[PDB]
Amino acid sequence: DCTMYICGDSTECSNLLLQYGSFCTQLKRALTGIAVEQDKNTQEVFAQVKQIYKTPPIKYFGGFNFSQILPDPSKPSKRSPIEDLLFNKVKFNGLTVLPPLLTDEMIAQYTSALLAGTITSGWTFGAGPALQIPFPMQMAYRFNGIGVTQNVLYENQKLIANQFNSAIGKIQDSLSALGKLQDVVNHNAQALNTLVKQLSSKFGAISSVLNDILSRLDPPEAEVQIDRLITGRLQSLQTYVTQQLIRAAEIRASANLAATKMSECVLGQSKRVDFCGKGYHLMSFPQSAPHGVVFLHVTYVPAQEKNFTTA
Amino acid sequence: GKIQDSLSALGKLQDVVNHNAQALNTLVKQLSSKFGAISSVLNDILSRLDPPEAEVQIDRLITGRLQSLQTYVTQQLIRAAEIRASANLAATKMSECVLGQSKRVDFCGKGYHLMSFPQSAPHGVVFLHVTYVPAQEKNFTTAPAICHDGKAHFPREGVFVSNGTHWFVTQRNFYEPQIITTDNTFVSGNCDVVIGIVNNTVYDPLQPELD
Amino acid sequence: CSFGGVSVITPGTNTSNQVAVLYQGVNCTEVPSNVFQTRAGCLIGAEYVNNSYECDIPIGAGICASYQTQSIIAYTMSLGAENSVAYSNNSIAIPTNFTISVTTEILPVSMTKTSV
Numbered sequence A: 001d002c003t004m005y006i007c008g009d010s011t012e013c014s015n016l017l018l019q020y021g022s023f024c025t026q027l028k029r030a031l032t033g034i035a036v037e038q039d040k041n042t043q044e045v046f047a048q049v050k051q052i053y054k055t056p057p058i059k060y061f062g063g064f065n066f067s068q069i070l071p072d073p074s075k076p077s078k079r080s081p082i083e084d085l086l087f088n089k090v091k092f093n094g095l096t097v098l099p100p101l102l103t104d105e106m107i108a109q110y111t112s113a114l115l116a117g118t119i120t121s122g123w124t125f126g127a128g129p130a131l132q133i134p135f136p137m138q139m140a141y142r143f144n145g146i147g148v149t150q151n152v153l154y155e156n157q158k159l160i161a162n163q164f165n166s167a168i169g170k171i172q173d174s175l176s177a178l179g180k181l182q183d184v185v186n187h188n189a190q191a192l193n194t195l196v197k198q199l200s201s202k203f204g205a206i207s208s209v210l211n212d213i214l215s216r217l218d219p220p221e222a223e224v225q226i227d228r229l230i231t232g233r234l235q236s237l238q239t240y241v242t243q244q245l246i247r248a249a250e251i252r253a254s255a256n257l258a259a260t261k262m263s264e265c266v267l268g269q270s271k272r273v274d275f276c277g278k279g280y281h282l283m284s285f286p287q288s289a290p291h292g293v294v295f296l297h298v299t300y301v302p303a304q305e306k307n308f309t310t311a
Numbered sequence B: 001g002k003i004q005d006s007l008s009a010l011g012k013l014q015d016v017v018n019h020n021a022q023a024l025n026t027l028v029k030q031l032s033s034k035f036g037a038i039s040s041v042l043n044d045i046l047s048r049l050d051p052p053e054a055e056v057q058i059d060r061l062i063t064g065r066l067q068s069l070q071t072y073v074t075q076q077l078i079r080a081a082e083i084r085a086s087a088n089l090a091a092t093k094m095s096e097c098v099l100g101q102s103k104r105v106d107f108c109g110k111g112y113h114l115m116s117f118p119q120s121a122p123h124g125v126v127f128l129h130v131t132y133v134p135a136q137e138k139n140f141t142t143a144p145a146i147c148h149d150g151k152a153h154f155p156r157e158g159v160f161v162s163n164g165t166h167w168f169v170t171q172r173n174f175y176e177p178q179i180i181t182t183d184n185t186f187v188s189g190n191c192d193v194v195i196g197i198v199n200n201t202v203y204d205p206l207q208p209e210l211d
Numbered sequence C: 001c002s003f004g005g006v007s008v009i010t011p012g013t014n015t016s017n018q019v020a021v022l023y024q025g026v027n028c029t030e031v032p033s034n035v036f037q038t039r040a041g042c043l044i045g046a047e048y049v050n051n052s053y054e055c056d057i058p059i060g061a062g063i064c065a066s067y068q069t070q071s072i073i074a075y076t077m078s079l080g081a082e083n084s085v086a087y088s089n090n091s092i093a094i095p096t097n098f099t100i101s102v103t104t105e106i107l108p109v110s111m112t113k114t115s116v
Ligand SMILES: *[C@@H]1O[C@H](CO)[C@@H](O[C@@H]2O[C@H](CO)[C@@H](O)[C@H](O)[C@H]2NC(C)=O)[C@H](O)[C@H]1NC(C)=O
Pocket: A060, A065, A066, A067, A068
């Protein structure tokens, strides 16, 4: 609130603040632009599915055990076991914080739909109707896409499923990382703590309180002292809003990268090197994090080479 | 042909025009502000005061309007970086969607990318994305491999399907069944390691040619 | 003492001259028909229903507003049609036909060059 930040309650100030033109209109327009884009950023990363898919009751996909990434029915929030860890690591003088349009329950529903679509129909639902195929056969096509002959899975199905289940299980140990998400929170908290502290500055005036000036001074001289404080605190708002625009462009570029990976790593198989993890991309599973997204990248890594003569 | 009906959309192009028009309308309006000075017409303040008294009042107005220019130019630099990032995306799509065929998901429209055609727009570009979308699915029973002579047969490309009584090989993107032969499949391993392998007949063309 | 911006929600004059007002994180007992309390503030002038439609005029935190038939309503954006995939351990679905689709994408490339 431009008027409540600068003046603050006083009403003799309001007539003086009107004399600087439309600076307070510019601040509201600039901040509204940011506020609208931040909800669109989230829709573009997560709202990439038409229908809300559900997995079948049995939940047994040829062995592979996905219980650590699917929702837990015995919870009010319906988060997955890994999502519960991810959210466990991360008013003033005219300042207010607006709520997001999408609750985190709604985001969890987009993530469970992407998980249920992929595990049952692979990548077909992102290009049209969802076409069911057994999951073991889905994995075999994915090895074929990286140049491995499909019998390697069919003759070793149990080995790959058991090794996968332990490899995904190790992910929780590495968590129980998210510094990129805490930094976003810190940067805004620091700008709001600084913006408030800048009200206790005299900027070379007799005082820093627009009521005390009048109490011990005549109008002819009080207009000058209040005008100095107004200029100083108006400069504070210009600094604040300029940095929010520069920082919002950076989170927007990150949301564009996350939306691009959501399409190319989760809704399909990529050949782009290092774009979907280290190794040969097989598949990826999304998880929701506070103000962010976590990608679980499944890759193919060769091992135990022997040397041969060739021609 | 339906594309014209959807047009007769371009809000992203009008927003660019609006943002600059608003900065130019604001920049001019900020000249009618006193900033705590005596008046805002550099003339009044002149033909009305002394060389040493009209200097303080004019210096206040100069500082105020100089701050206006700094605000204007800083925002143009921040906004020009955003249109530059958009021009980089448009140039990248021009190469990868128009001059070739992309496998990148959702980069060249919704569906399986076939081709794209550019159109010019004022201060922008429009891409007409042509995609392949499958339709009208049927369900079938499937199996990873087929056993014949005690050996496991795997498809070269495609999936095994069953219509209820007979099994066929089909390609994965269009239903088009063919008979399972030794020229359609390859052999690898025995029928003791594949889970879900089924018995069927794989026909050899050689023997019925030799009667 | 409570305070909070005031915005005016309008289905655009060119369709109706009504309006609803949301007082951001203001309780509906400390503002000074259809009064609805939401976690995002006090919503006045729209009735809250339990159905769901597509987002029209985003209000915030899951709620939207819009016209219906003659008035303004505030519902909770639904996420989409629900659908179960008919998964089994030996079933597949293969298309037998196809269509060719055309879609547009629009990108800005330049601004007007200004000089002061
Ligand atoms: C999927 O994995 C989970 C563990 O991540 C399995 O649940 C655990 O099973 C062990 C026995 O194998 C129990 O001692 C634990 O108490 C279980 N954990 C929980 C939270 O219940 C689960 O059984 C696996 N699913 C399948 C089908 O094997």
